[PDB]
Enzyme design. Structure first.
Site, short mmCIF file in Angstrom:
data_model
loop_
_atom_site.label_atom_id
_atom_site.label_comp_id
_atom_site.label_asym_id
_atom_site.label_seq_id
_atom_site.Cartn_x
_atom_site.Cartn_y
_atom_site.Cartn_z
N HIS A 45 0.80 -1.21 0.00
CA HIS A 45 0.00 0.00 0.00
C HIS A 45 0.85 1.27 0.00
CE1 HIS A 45 0.31 0.61 4.53
NE2 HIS A 45 0.36 1.85 4.08
N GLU A 59 19.91 6.72 7.21
CA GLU A 59 19.15 7.91 7.59
C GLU A 59 18.79 7.92 9.08
OE1 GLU A 59 18.78 10.72 7.37
OE2 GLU A 59 17.43 11.21 5.74
N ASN A 61 18.00 11.67 10.89
CA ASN A 61 17.30 12.94 11.01
C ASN A 61 16.89 13.29 9.59
OD1 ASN A 61 16.71 15.79 11.11
ND2 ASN A 61 17.73 15.80 13.12
N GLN A 64 18.20 16.97 8.58
CA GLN A 64 19.56 17.40 8.90
C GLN A 64 20.60 16.38 8.49
OE1 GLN A 64 20.64 19.85 10.39
NE2 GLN A 64 18.81 20.51 11.49
N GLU A 69 24.09 9.18 5.34
CA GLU A 69 23.08 8.82 4.36
C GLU A 69 23.47 8.52 2.92
OE1 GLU A 69 23.80 11.32 5.94
OE2 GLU A 69 22.17 12.60 6.62
N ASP A 93 0.02 -7.35 2.15
CA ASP A 93 0.54 -5.99 2.10
C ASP A 93 2.06 -6.02 2.17
OD1 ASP A 93 0.67 -3.26 1.96
OD2 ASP A 93 -0.19 -2.86 3.94
N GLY A 186 2.84 6.55 8.11
CA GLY A 186 4.21 6.91 7.80
C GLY A 186 5.22 5.86 8.27
N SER A 188 4.28 2.70 8.04
CA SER A 188 3.91 1.61 7.14
C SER A 188 5.09 1.24 6.26
CB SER A 188 2.70 2.00 6.29
OG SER A 188 1.54 2.05 7.11
N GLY A 189 5.22 -0.07 6.02
CA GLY A 189 6.31 -0.57 5.20
C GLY A 189 7.57 -0.87 6.00
#
Ligand SMILES: [Cl-]
Length: 240
Positions: A45, A59, A61, A64, A69, A93, A186, A188-189
């Site tokens: 989804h 990752e 922040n 910032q 990253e 899902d 947010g 999710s996944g």
């Protein structure tokens, strides 16, 4: 994540921030787990809609420089075939994203270890949900990766009337439900790291929460059970 705290920068190296850009700016929308240098496991989804997606590994922040990253484009989206857009209740899902190129592994970017096929934990097993999702129902995304302790709630209990009823399927894992800690939009996944004989493993893929709110007593956060899709995962990776 609601009721959690800022996770130590390098505690969950397989966690990635899935971002899309429809407009002039990139936006974090979901979580994900790095399973191969060029493959990320997320929720269907999260990727059965938008057109441009990119994954950020190492990752922490979102607003910032953490100076660790790595940004990469998603080259192909492989959503589970049985998935039905806008239908988390039916399940499936899960989706695999093939990265434009392989990320470089290091202390902050490591592959997530998946549980052996068919593995299911005992009720109240310790897990940690991690993500940049809403920190409050109807709230805003978190700037720093959050983590919240959410013990598992077995199927026998989760599928009971007072909890999720028939909405939950055995292909799903339930965690939390104390009315204080939970995943939220947010997240999710992203992964549900659950202890297996003392060591964590990504047992779930955040899928959904109650419509009455993220943190709802007896409405544990629901995740796709990774161990139910090991073969599917191996099949996709073996299909390019
Ligand atoms: Cl979401």
């Amino acid at each position: 994540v609601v009721g959690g705290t800022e996770a130590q920068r390098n505690s969950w190296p397989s966690q990635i921030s899935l971002q899309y850009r429809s407009g002039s700016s990139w936006a974090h929308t979901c979580g994900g787990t790095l399973i191969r240098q060029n493959w990320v496991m997320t929720a269907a989804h999260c990727v059965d809609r938008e057109l441009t997606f990119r994954v950020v590994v190492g990752e922490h922040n979102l607003n910032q420089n953490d100076g660790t990253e790595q940004y990469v484009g998603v080259q192909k989206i492989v959503v589970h075939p049985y998935w039905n857009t806008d239908d988390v209740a039916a399940g499936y899902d899960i989706a695999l994203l093939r990265l434009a190129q392989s990320v470089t592994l290091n202390s902050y970017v490591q592959l997530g270890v998946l549980p052996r096929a068919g593995t299911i934990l005992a009720n109240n097993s310790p897990c940690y949900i991690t993500g940049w999702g809403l920190t409050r129902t109807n709230g805003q995304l978190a700037q720093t990766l959050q983590q919240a302790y959410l013990p598992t709630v077995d199927y026998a209990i989760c599928s009971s009337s007072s909890y999720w009823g028939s909405t939950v399927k055995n292909s799903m894992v339930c965690a939390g439900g104390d009315g204080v800690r939970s995943g939220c939009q947010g997240d999710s996944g992203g992964p549900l790291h659950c202890l297996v004989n003392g060591q964590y493993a990504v047992h779930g893929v955040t899928s959904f929460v109650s419509r009455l709110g993220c943190n709802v007593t007896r409405k544990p956060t629901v995740f796709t059970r990774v161990s139910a899709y090991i073969s599917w995962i191996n099949n996709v990776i073996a299909s390019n």
